[PDB]
């Protein structure tokens, strides 16, 4: 049940992002811990540096490298993941 | 003896709601207490927060998380159960 | 012509619920539509998310944010209004 | 009404975050617009690139240039500001 609200990312990396989130969703419960898992996994598989924001009420204005941005919902929680240099 | 009028929830969760309501009807007589039993158990087995209305004459307008809504008739009473928050 | 049965909300917000309820009863006759009017108006003036139950025979067990609950009689109908989620 | 939860940045850089953030709230009400207002200014006062998160319920794990991280509460809203 994943809804991509905004994305500038390859469909395979998009599919990778949601898959990575689901597993993070399986094991961890604190948004900080969910975010840490995501940022680490995306820092290895694709080169650093990534940042991940997990929450249900937040607003963001970020600067990201092109083709490295995704903002999506899994259930009721929003995940912001992007790469900035 | 249960007629489900509208639902946005899994069939496994649907049957559980009906089963839980039947148990509440066996033990309690006041609609408020019947609603309390269902809401509390549904806060335990599934994550908070749930809300329950049981009665014969009422109208409702609520907002619920997706995949977490059920409205069904059990016995002579209508039961509304959903999760918001 | 409202009797406040139970409330955990501002004396000023209490009057708005009663005032909004008076208008809802004037404009609509079906309990579902009365509830819809109230929840929407309270979604605009105060932030989401609100829920409203309108009827004469029902029992409810809900979870609400503090200082955002009211239960009162208006005319021939009891109105339950609270905010969760 | 500023309480810093954790910080790795200079004391003036600590203070400057509060002034721009406090002022932005006077002008804006939507969290995304608050973040845009602050983040743009912090690109000017210290040079790019900065990022800003404004909200009341969120968790973040970010990587920041050293001596360039702050996460703090203002009223009921948390503001995360860092440079990458």
């Amino acid at each position: 049940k994943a809804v991509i609200k905004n994305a500038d990312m390859s469909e395979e990396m998009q599919q990778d992002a949601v898959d990575c989130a689901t597993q993070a969703l399986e094991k961890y419960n604190i948004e900080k811990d969910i975010a840490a898992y995501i940022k680490k996994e995306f820092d290895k598989k694709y080169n650093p540096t990534w940042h991940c924001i997990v929450g249900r009420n937040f607003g963001s204005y970020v600067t990201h490298e092109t083709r490295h941005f995704i903002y999506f919902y899994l259930g009721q929680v929003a995940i912001l993941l992007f790469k900035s240099g | 003896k249960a007629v489900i009028k509208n639902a946005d929830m899994s069939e496994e969760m649907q049957q559980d709601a009906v089963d839980c309501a039947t148990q509440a009807l066996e033990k309690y007589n006041i609609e408020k207490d019947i609603a309390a039993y269902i809401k509390k158990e549904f806060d335990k087995k599934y994550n908070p927060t749930w809300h329950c209305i049981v009665g014969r004459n009422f109208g409702s307008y609520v907002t619920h998380e997706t995949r977490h809504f059920i409205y069904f008739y059990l016995g002579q009473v209508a039961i509304l159960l959903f999760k918001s928050g | 012509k409202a009797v406040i049965k139970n409330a955990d909300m501002s004396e000023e917000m209490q009057q708005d619920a009663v005032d909004c309820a008076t208008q809802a009863l004037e404009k609509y006759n079906i309990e579902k539509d009365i509830a819809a009017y109230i929840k929407k108006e309270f979604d605009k003036k105060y932030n989401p998310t609100w829920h409203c139950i309108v009827g004469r025979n029902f029992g409810s067990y809900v979870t609400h944010e503090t200082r955002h609950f009211i239960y009162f009689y208006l005319g021939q109908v009891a109105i339950l209004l609270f905010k969760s989620g | 009404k500023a309480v810093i939860k954790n910080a790795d940045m200079s004391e003036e850089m600590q203070q400057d975050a509060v002034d721009c953030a406090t002022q932005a709230l006077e002008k804006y009400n939507i969290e995304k617009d608050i973040a845009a207002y602050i983040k743009k200014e912090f690109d000017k006062k210290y040079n790019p690139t900065w990022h800003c998160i404004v909200g009341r319920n969120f968790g973040s794990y970010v990587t920041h240039e050293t001596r360039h991280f702050i996460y703090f509460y203002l009223g009921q809203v948390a503001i995360l500001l860092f440079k990458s």
Binding site: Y73 | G59, E65, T66 | - | -
Partner: peptide, 25 residues
Amino acid sequence: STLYKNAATQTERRTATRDAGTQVR
């Protein structure tokens, strides 16, 4: 060489939530 864009996000409680009305008949 490398192209960077600005981007903004806001959370809307609606996306994951649906409104429902019920009337006893």
